[PDB]
Write a protein that binds this DNA or RNA. Structure first.
Ligand SMILES: C#C[C@]1(COP(=O)(O)OP(=O)(O)OP(=O)(O)O)O[C@@H](n2cnc3c(N)nc(F)nc32)C[C@@H]1O
Ligand SMILES: [Mg+2]
Ligand SMILES: [Mg+2]
Ligand SMILES: [Mg+2]
Lengths: 398, 558
DNA sequence: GTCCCTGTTCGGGCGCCG
DNA sequence: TGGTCGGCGCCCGAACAGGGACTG
């Protein structure tokens, strides 16, 4: 019925050929139930092995609902295929409008690139493969093709509410308002009822930055000054105003680490001036949409996680921290997955783009459990790094 | 017969043509077997005679089957496989008997001439041309092409596996409570029915497969235990691996070690305590398979204890989803680990081992975490869930490790078992400088051209020493300086270095390393009672880092 | 930039199964 | 006597990529 739009790949790039990873029994049973209903409704069709492409798939179950959400890891296909006032609203609600993509057909010559495989427990059966006939959820081209149809749906609601910003990214709809809690949720329900005519909770105001802080002591040892000098020396790469001349001359000689060193008047003021320079904003940092956002995370212990967002070295666009429970049953991997989801969400609100993460975790450790704590519809790109304990120390807190 | 299922469309790679390889000479015995097979396949339409309009050819040969009485027609399609399109393999792994659930009735059967019953794409058939010689000048060689899947072609396994799945799909939908383990053409069928009603359903399955052109000869129709399946023996309430025979040579070659370690890894799935570290080390630096290799004392001893394990009777049980999955891990030396997965004590579902060495420097806690992750992924494949663990590490030891470790690490639900050797950290670095300990300022420096270097220290108590080095690197000299300070210091020492490379290695608390220098450092760290390691930026005039830097740079820098 | 060191990935041999 | 194909497993070495230290 609806006319399709031709979509192609980048020049010199083939389709994705990523293997399927092991899936638990509950995810496989959920995917089989979902795929049968998607196949009955013409959304997907079975394919054979002559299609050489494949994309991994899994499923997430949101907290309090027996509903499962099919997630396709399309970030390899996406590689091969902004409202500034949004970050200033009291409340921003994220709506999952991925089901709206199933009403638009997909280009016939592109469907072979959406291939995925449903595994079986204990390899009872060979993998059973499918491909998409409509706009798939989590694909880069789905919001672009549906963009014209999305504006027609939101046009009356946007005109009736001019002070409400509605931003779309992937299968998500970000709706922010300055209304009071209660009036905001009532307005969100109006939007959901507005979306049902066609078919078929954040607070950016409280987002803060974590600046670099220096220790405050009455008695300083050689070791204290050596650690402070090393931290300021690294900080000078970000803040060129940082000086360490008067603090370094206190360390002349070959002294014991536990020897107490009195701070001179010049060194005392040099430390006080350095505290003011760290409070000033970083100079000359301009966002580049053509470049990728890079997010580094450092595990600080006791449930504390620091992160920085940049595109060039020492050109931080944002520095924050992420604290959680400090109990004994702490799951480092679970906390790390919650951290990357919050960092990605902030990057989508501020810049409308997902960052590339440098994760401080073994590759095997992450891939084994990260899908067990994922709740978003998108998946950022990431790499694994052996972080030196130096950058971990520089963003520490007292 | 030939299955009425639709063919899978297959193309060649762009700008490619079919193979043109002439037949190599064959034994008279093999020629007699091939002509008997091909005259019958030609009568059934599975192959078709071709004339001069087909310019292609590919060599053929034959080997014995597992029955040892029948022959298997093979084709050396190596050239056509290079020119055939890519496929996505649908076979994601191998089924394991430990994942089988208890069934009331069990049947194992096999399809006769499985490949030769699935039709091949008509446009691709000409590329499968082959020639069969005969009696010379009394009847010349006959040329054929394949109308069915050939044995030797790249696309045959995935096409058959996908076609077999489509064929079984109507039966599975009609009988969702009858489990059919489908590996190639080999079918394990289990039900919770009485043996009478079960065999009637088996005949429904055999009739269903026959309707889709797949015969099930009674010769390969197993009806009583033990069932021979996938290299195992399936009893009603237990399973075992078919007898494994290790080679018993007095002069082992690389190929002999390959088949030795291969059968040991295969045995480790049910035989506990298998080790292959010393036998696998003998393969380093080797070139060809014919390389005879002398066995070391450790390798000779490792094989001896492996042979004694294989003499004991062992078996596994089947999976009960109403019980928990338990994985207990035992430590052996040299980065080797073994584990037993069970639901009831002393009733192993399966066993295994983990001995992969990750990283140049590591400790027993890292390797244990890596083994837990390997068993977790393996358990999700076989049983679809994560097991509960029984680990030989104290809760306090783990709490200390992941508190100070900069990376995120986690172990699922587990408890401690006192089965030595226990996993522990062999030393801990202090968090604060040590009062009353001598403070060493260490540094190393090396010349890139001459490869000469110096390592040394200066102390707050007036001591200093410089050691010259030959054929070294800047990283090695910094490690040599730390090693020197550990040798000449007391039981408690403060060490200040400018090398984050050496700092990161020591902060991870390794107990084993590929570097002998690092191993020497580890032995020093274990003997100390308190060690504090601090870092300062190099070339910043900080004392006494400036003093030692000026000491080790003289004569190799500037 | 180069040199060094450490990480992952791919392909080679063998094992096992059809 | 070999000599074919695909899957998974193992361990090995070759060929990368990424980051720190270095020359003048
Ligand atoms: C599907 C399938 C099968 C089943 O193996 P079988 O051992 O069952 O041989 P059959 O073709 O089925 O003839 P049968 O003796 O059973 O009447 O796996 C494939 N296969 C088995 N052994 C080999 C082998 N050595 N090489 C290749 F390339 N394929 C094989 C091809 C075969 O058709
Ligand atoms: Mg057969
Ligand atoms: Mg078989
Ligand atoms: Mg140095």
């Amino acid at each position: 019925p609806i006319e399709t739009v031709p979509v192609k790949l980048k020049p010199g790039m083939d389709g994705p050929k990523v293997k399927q990873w092991p899936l638990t029994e509950e995810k496989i049973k959920a995917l089989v139930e979902i795929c049968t209903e998607m196949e009955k409704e013409g959304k997907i069709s079975k394919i054979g092995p002559e299609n050489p492409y494949n994309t991994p798939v899994f499923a997430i179950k949101k907290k309090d609902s027996t509903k499962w959400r099919k997630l396709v890891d399309f970030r390899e296909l996406n590689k091969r295929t902004h409202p500034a006032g949004l970050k200033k609203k009291k409340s921003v609600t994220v709506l999952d409008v991925g089901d709206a993509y199933f009403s638009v057909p997909l280009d016939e010559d592109f469907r072979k690139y959406t291939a995925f495989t449903i595994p079986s427990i204990n390899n009872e059966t060979p993998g059973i493969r499918y491909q998409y006939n409509v706009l798939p959820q989590g694909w880069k081209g789905s919001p672009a093709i549906f963009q014209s149809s999305m504006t027609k749906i939101l046009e009356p609601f946007r005109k009736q509410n001019p002070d409400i910003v509605i931003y779309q990214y992937m299968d998500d709809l970000y709706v922010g308002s300055d209304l009071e809690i209660g009036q905001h949720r009532t307005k969100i329900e109006e939007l959901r009822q507005h979306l049902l005519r066609w078919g078929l909770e954040l607070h950016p105001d409280k987002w803060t930055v974590q600046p670099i802080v220096l220790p405050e002591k009455d008695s300083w040892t050689v070791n204290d000054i050596q650690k402070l000098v090393g931290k300021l020396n690294w900080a000078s790469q970000i803040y060129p105003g940082i000086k360490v001349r008067q603090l370094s001359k206190l360390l002349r000689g070959t002294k014991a680490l536990t020897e107490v060193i009195p701070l001179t008047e010049e060194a005392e003021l040099e430390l006080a001036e350095n505290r003011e320079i760290l409070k000033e904003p970083v100079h000359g940092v301009y966002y580049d949409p053509s470049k990728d956002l890079i997010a580094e995370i450092q595990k600080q212990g006791q449930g504390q996680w620091t992160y920085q967002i940049y595109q060039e070295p020492f050109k931080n666009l944002k520095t924050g921290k992420y604290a959680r429970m400090r109990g004994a049953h702490t799951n480092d991997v679970k906390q790390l997955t919650e951290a990357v989801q919050k960092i990605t969400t902030e990057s989508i609100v501020i810049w409308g783009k997902t960052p590339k993460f440098k994760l401080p975790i073994q590759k095997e450790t992450w891939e084994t459990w990260w899908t067990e704590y994922w709740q978003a519809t998108w998946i950022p790109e990431w790499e694994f790094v052996n972080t030196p304990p130096l950058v971990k120390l520089w963003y520490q807190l007292e | 017969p030939i299955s009425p299922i639709e063919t899978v469309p297959v193309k060649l790679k762009p700008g490619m043509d079919g193979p043109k390889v002439k037949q190599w000479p064959l034994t008279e015995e093999k020629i007699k077997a091939l002509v008997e097979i091909c005259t019958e396949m030609e009568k059934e339409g599975k192959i078709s005679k071709i004339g001069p309009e087909n310019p292609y050819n590919t060599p053929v040969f034959a080997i014995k089957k597992k029955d040892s009485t029948k022959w298997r027609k093979l084709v050396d399609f190596r050239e056509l496989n290079k020119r055939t399109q890519d496929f996505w393999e649908v076979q994601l792994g191998i089924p394991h008997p430990a994942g089988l659930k208890k069934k009331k009735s069990v049947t194992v059967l096999d399809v006769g001439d499985a490949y030769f019953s699935v039709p091949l794409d008509e446009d691709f058939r000409k590329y499968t041309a082959f020639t069969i010689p005969s009696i010379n000048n009394e009847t010349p060689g006959i040329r054929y092409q394949y109308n069915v899947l050939p044995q030797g072609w790249k696309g045959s396994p995935a096409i058959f596996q996908s076609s077999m799945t489509k064929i079984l799909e109507p039966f599975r939908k009609q009988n969702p409570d009858i489990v059919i383990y489908q590996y190639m053409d080999d079918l394990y069928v289990g039900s919770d029915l009485e043996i009478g009603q079960h065999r009637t359903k088996i005949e429904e399955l055999r009739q269903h497969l026959l309707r889709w052109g797949l015969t099930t000869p009674d010769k390969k129709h197993q009806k009583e235990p033990p069932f021979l399946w996938m290299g195992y023996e399936l009893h009603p309430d237990k399973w075992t691996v078919q007898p494994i025979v290790l080679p018993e040579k007095d002069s082992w070659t690389v190929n002999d070690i390959c088949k030795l370690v291969g059968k040991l890894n295969w045995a480790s799935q049910i035989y506990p305590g298998i080790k292959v570290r010393q036998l696998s080390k003998l393969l380093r630096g080797t070139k060809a398979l014919t390389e005879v290799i002398p066995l070391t004392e450790e390798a000779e001893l490792e094989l001896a204890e492996n042979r004694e394990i294989l003499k004991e009777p062992v078996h596994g049980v089947y999976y009960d989803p109403s019980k928990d999955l338990i994985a207990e891990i035992q430590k052996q030396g040299q980065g080797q680990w073994t584990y037993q997965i069970y639901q009831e004590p002393f009733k192993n579902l399966k066993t295994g081992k983990y001995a992969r060495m990750r990283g140049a420097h590591t400790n027993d806690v890292k390797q244990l975490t890596e083994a837990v992750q390997k068993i977790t992924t393996e358990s999700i494949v076989i049983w679809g869930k994560t097991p509960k663990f029984k680990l030989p590490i104290q809760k306090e030891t783990w709490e200390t490790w992941w508190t100070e470790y900069w990376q995120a690490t986690w172990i699922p639900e587990w408890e401690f078992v006192n089965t030595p050797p226990l996993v522990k950290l062999w030393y801990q670095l202090e968090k604060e400088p040590i009062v009353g300990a001598e403070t060493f300022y260490v540094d190393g420096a090396a010349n890139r051209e001459t490869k000469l270097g110096k390592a040394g220290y200066v102390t707050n108590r007036g001591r200093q020493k410089v050691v010259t080095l030959t054929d070294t690197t800047n990283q090695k000299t910094e490690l040599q300086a730390i090693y020197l300070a550990l040798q000449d210091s007391g039981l408690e020492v403060n060490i200040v270095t400018d090398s984050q490379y050496a700092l990161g290695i020591i902060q991870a608390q390794p107990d084993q390393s590929e570097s002998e220098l690092v191993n020497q450092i580890i032995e020093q760290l274990i003997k100390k009672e308190k060690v504090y390691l601090a870092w300062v930026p190099a070339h910043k005039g900080i004392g006494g880092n400036e003093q030692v830097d000026k000491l080790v740079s003289a004569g190799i820098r500037k």
